[PDB]
RNA sequence: GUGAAGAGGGAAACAACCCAGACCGCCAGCUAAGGUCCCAAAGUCAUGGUUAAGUGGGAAACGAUGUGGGAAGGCCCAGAC
RNA sequence: UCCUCCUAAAGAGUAACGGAGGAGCACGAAGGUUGGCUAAUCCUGGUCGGACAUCAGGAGGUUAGUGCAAUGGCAUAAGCC
RNA sequence: GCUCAACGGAUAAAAGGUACUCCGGGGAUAACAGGCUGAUACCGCCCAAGAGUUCAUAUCGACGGCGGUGUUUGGCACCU
RNA sequence: UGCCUGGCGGCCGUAGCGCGGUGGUCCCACCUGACCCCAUGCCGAACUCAGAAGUGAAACGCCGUAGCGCCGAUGGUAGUGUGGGGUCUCCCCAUGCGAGAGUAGGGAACUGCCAGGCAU
Ligand SMILES: [Mg+2]
Ligand SMILES: [Mg+2]
Ligand SMILES: [Mg+2]
Ligand SMILES: [Mg+2]
Ligand SMILES: [Mg+2]
Ligand SMILES: [Mg+2]
Ligand SMILES: [Mg+2]
Ligand SMILES: [Mg+2]
Ligand SMILES: [Mg+2]
Ligand SMILES: [Mg+2]
Ligand SMILES: [Mg+2]
Ligand SMILES: [Mg+2]
Ligand SMILES: [Mg+2]
Ligand SMILES: [Mg+2]
Ligand SMILES: [Mg+2]
Ligand SMILES: [Mg+2]
Ligand SMILES: [Mg+2]
Ligand SMILES: [Mg+2]
Ligand SMILES: [Mg+2]
Ligand SMILES: [Mg+2]
Ligand SMILES: [Mg+2]
Ligand SMILES: [Mg+2]
Ligand SMILES: [Mg+2]
Ligand SMILES: [Mg+2]
Ligand SMILES: [Mg+2]
Ligand SMILES: [Mg+2]
């Protein structure tokens with residue numbers, strides 16, 4: 001089981017996403033179902049450790065945003081081209 | 095000393111293109127497009143020349159539009 | 175030495191080598207040698223690094239080569255002035271962007287692939303790194 | 311009447327011709343020249359275009 | 369197949385009348401019946417129509433798909449067109465040969481008063 | 485875009501770089517780039533860190549228990565190294 | 566000297582002893598119009614007849630064709646009778 | 647009626663030599679040398695397949711890679 | 727008004743293919759015949775004419791079906807205008823624009839005029 005803590009992005013775009021990855025974070029999005037897509041932000045080192053397991057990309061994950069748990073699955077991940085880092089993750093609502 | 099070439103040539107630029115754009119009021123007979131083929135096609139009140147030149151048969155504003163099943167580009171003169 | 179058999183044209187512009195790469199993930203095999211730097215390689219550098227890892231695995235396992243040198247590089251001869259046509263095609267390169275997986279390998283352990291890709295990377299001008307097959 | 315103060319704070323020597331025309335449209339002439347213009351979107355667009363070398367005072 | 373080749377055979381003069389702005393008479397021909405309709409230059413609505421499927425025309429006839437039926441149709445559509453004030457049209461053969469029942473129809477419409 | 489056809493201040497000196505466009509005069513003031521120990525105008529300013537190489541104040545592949553910070557890990561008072 | 570493409574930086578235009586190719590004609594029908602038609606290639610079967618003549622069906626759907634270079638066009642065919 | 651094709655066509659009609667040479671000019675343009683550069687050259691270094699009885703690194707060092715100097719052959723044509 | 731069908735359009739693949747099913751009162755289609763109108767570089771195949779015995783087999787139309795085709799966000803990424811910066815063959819920062827591909831998902835078209843048939 002993986003429990004991830006997230007925060008709703010106050011601002012979006014290229015400059016913001018570069019600036020989060022400056023401040024050791026990275027954006028993600030939760031989508032799927034009838035609910036609207038949710039633009040979140042994660043801590044990079046936690047999720048980078050959690051993703052080393054295939055359990056991460058197989059099991060159902062709990063994302064806590066505003067104290068609201070969301071069971072999702074890792075649909076797709078954008079990785080850094082030559083560094084062991086994460087750019088962005090798509091989460092599908094289970 | 096030595097060398098040569100075989101690739102020195104090129105031809106003159108024929109100044110094709112779109113001479114009057116959309117929403118641009120023209121007189122009758124005004125050349126809209128010069129072109130080789132029918133990259134565009136003649137719509138309403140627009141004639142096609144010998145060299146596939148698109149000219150206005152009437153006066154009014156140019157309307158670019160895509161019609162037909164093949165999504166071909168037609169040029170028409172709206173009335174005004 | 176890798177080289178296109180036919181080409182539609184004999185010569186090519188110098189171009190540029192900006193942008194990020196596309197062959198980023200380890201597609202086929204298990205271990206990969208990923209380019210970090212930027213530049214152009216050649217068929218000689220490719221074949222030398224292939225030899226160094228084929229010998230380092232003692233032809234055990236399977237090696238993919240993801241790149242192919244398709245860009246011809248011309249040079250003018252010595253004591254020839256700067257005019258009078260484009261120079262003659264001398265060798266072939268592959269433009270390498272950061273992130274390009276250059277080689278892949280499987281059927282061997284990880285440590286053997288490390289020492290093989292290190293022996294190969296000593297023949298290559300660009301700075302490389304070692305990567306593994308990521309799930310997703 | 312929703313009018314603002316615009317003050318040229320940098321020089322216009324090596325700047326683009328389009329920026330020089332924008333400063334002429336604002337009526338700015340020299341540095342430190344404080345001018346008083348109405349607040350329209352067209353004015354705000356010129357200020358957006360030369361925001362590096364003016365200082366708008368609301 | 370045959371339907372498609374008839375359409376290909378017709379779609380040149382149809383597009384030509386489309387750019388001519390011509391009010392157009394459309395003939396359609398079957399082995400049993402023959403159809404006619406006068407179409408506005410927008411091509412989206414009709415003005416008059418006649419056929420051998422109508423009872424008022426078909427009951428006066430022997431067989432619906434002969435030349436005598438085709439002349440009675442072109443006469444009826446001409447009398448309806450002149451009733452509605454439509455006089456000058458352009459005949460669209462709709463990929464048929466101008467021959468036989470089609471020619472007898474257009475000759476009947478010319479004789480009744482249409483102008484093409 | 486500048487020079488050419490454009491001076492001034494700065495980059496030691498340095499047409500073309502940075503700031504900035506010289507009507508004239510003044511033993512007045514504010515600033516730009518760039519700077520503030522002395523040559524040489526102005527902070528030996530403040531606070532918190534890093535560097536020990538005169539690095540700063542010239543250079544690569546590569547090499548190395550230099551050193552600072554961070555996240556994780558596997559052995560361990562059932563006694564680790 | 567002329568034509569076509571790239572260079573040419575999504576209007577036009579744009580240079581080099583830059584990269585690649587052509588033209589210095591032909592046609593009294595290879596023009597006009599009306600009417601009609603629709604390719605390449607492959608598969609199977611079939612007398613001489615064979616990888617490949619002609620014939621019949623099917624796949625395919627313009628990968629063909631355009632008097633000649635290339636580019637852009639072309640099914641309403643500008644292609645073919 | 648012109649391959650006036652040197653194709654905006656100097657004339658209807660035209661090839662060469664000069665170390666016997668001369669004038670006007672040019673560092674707008676070459677040779678010498680300087681300068682920039684450093685492909686080449688030279689000097690180093692990296693990896694280490696191998697050779698060296700065994701043994702990569704005593705001595706060499708394939709395939710390939712990174713630099714330095716300004717020293718050759720050259721490039722440009724900034725001074726004269 | 728409902729259903730079905732034919733014709734002419736609009737639109738131009740969420741509209742197309744495929745697979746399965748289904749239709750014949752009318753319509754349509756095949757279909758019968760051809761001395762004639764007309765036709766075949768031979769051939770009533772086609773074109774055409776005179777018809778209506780048969781069949782919906784084919785074709786067409788309709789219904790269904792996600793094997794495709796097609797459409798397609800959100801977020802991010804690439805790029806880039808201006809300004810600024812660096813270790814300057816390439817990148818970064820502020821700001822503005824913002825893809826393509828891909829993902830979720832959608833999706834087995836919609837609509838107008840006239841006419842006819844059967845029901846109502
Ligand atoms: Mg930006
Ligand atoms: Mg000056
Ligand atoms: Mg100065
Ligand atoms: Mg200096
Ligand atoms: Mg000075
Ligand atoms: Mg300052
Ligand atoms: Mg002082
Ligand atoms: Mg102090
Ligand atoms: Mg252009
Ligand atoms: Mg442009
Ligand atoms: Mg022809
Ligand atoms: Mg025709
Ligand atoms: Mg055969
Ligand atoms: Mg001449
Ligand atoms: Mg000339
Ligand atoms: Mg002598
Ligand atoms: Mg002299
Ligand atoms: Mg000179
Ligand atoms: Mg010499
Ligand atoms: Mg010299
Ligand atoms: Mg040097
Ligand atoms: Mg060298
Ligand atoms: Mg030994
Ligand atoms: Mg050694
Ligand atoms: Mg060697
Ligand atoms: Mg020297």
Ligand SMILES: [Mg+2]
Nearest residue numbers: 683684720721
């Ligand atoms: Mg030299």
Ligand SMILES: [Mg+2]
Nearest residue numbers: 674722723724
């Ligand atoms: Mg020069």
Ligand SMILES: [Mg+2]
Nearest residue numbers: 679680725726
């Ligand atoms: Mg000198």
Ligand SMILES: [Mg+2]
Nearest residue numbers: 745746747748
């Ligand atoms: Mg079916």
Ligand SMILES: [Mg+2]
Nearest residue numbers: 399756757770
């Ligand atoms: Mg028949």
Ligand SMILES: [Mg+2]
Nearest residue numbers: 782783784785
């Ligand atoms: Mg059936």
Ligand SMILES: [Mg+2]
Nearest residue numbers: 800801802825
């Ligand atoms: Mg987007």
Ligand SMILES: [Mg+2]
Nearest residue numbers: 798825826827
């Ligand atoms: Mg998109």
Ligand SMILES: [Mg+2]
Nearest residue numbers: 741742796834
């Ligand atoms: Mg569909």
Ligand SMILES: [Mg+2]
Nearest residue numbers: 743744790834
């Ligand atoms: Mg269907």
